[model samples]
Target: GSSGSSGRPARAKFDFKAQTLKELPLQKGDIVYIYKQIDQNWYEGEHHGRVGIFPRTYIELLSGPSSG
Candidate 1:
C-alpha cells in the first residue's frame, strides 16, 4: 500500500499499508512479539502464526516465529 500525498502521487510505505501495523523503532528482520488484550484476557502470538485479536496498534512485525 502507499501513502497519497496532497500534491504528489501515492508512494509505497514499507510492506503494507503504512498504518496497518504497529510502527516500531526497530528495523526489519528484528524479532518482536505482540500480546494483545482481548475482552479482558491477553494472548501472545508471533509474526508467523498471527491469530486472535490483533489490534492494528498491537500488531508487530518480526523476523520470524519463536516456535519455528
Candidate 2:
C-alpha cells in the first residue's frame, strides 16, 4: 500500500540481457525507473526509453518502498 504511482528509481547491480521481448535488458550501473510489480520476484521497469520486466534482485532500489 505504500508504493507510489510515480515510478521508483533504481540502479542496476549486475548486467542482464533480456531473454524475451517482454524483459528488460540491463547493464551494470544503469539507472532504471521502476514501475508495476509483476510478481514477488519481477517488476516492470524502463531504461533508455525501453520498458519491460526484470528481476527485482538485479537492481538496487535507490528509494525505499515506504514514504517515510
Candidate 3:
C-alpha cells in the first residue's frame, strides 16, 4: 500500500462568479485536492477528478488536515 496521502483539501476563498469546465470554477466552500505547487501564486490540482490550475488567493488551505 502507498504510504503517502494524496494531498490535503483546501476551500475556495470566494465564488468564481463564472463557471467553466477548463477551470473548475470554485464556489465558495468548494473543496479541491491540491496536487502540486505550480508557483508561488498558482497551484496545479484536481477538483472532483477534473484537473486545472488555481491561484493561491482563490483558495485557502484549511487549518484542518495538515502536517506539522
- Please, what are the lDDT tens digits per residue for candidate 1 over residues 1-68? 88432121111122322233332232233333444434433223334333233323333433332332
Best by lDDT: 2
- As a whole number from 0 to 100, the lDDT of residue 42 in candidate 3 is 81
In model 3, residue pairs whose N, Cα or C atoms come closer than 3 Å (at least 3 residues apart or on different chains), thus clashing, are: none
lDDT of each: 0.32, 0.84, 0.75
Give the worst 10-residue stretch by lDDT in candidate 1.
5-14
- The per-prediction tally of clashing pairs is 0, 0, 0
Segments of candidate 3 deviating more than 4 angstroms: 1-4, 17-22
Q: What global local distance difference test value does model 3 have?
A: 0.75
Candidate 3: tens digits of C-alpha lDDT, residues 1-68: 67666766888988763356545567788988787887899876777667777788999987767763
TM-score against native, each model? 0.21, 0.79, 0.72
What's model 3's lDDT at 2? 71
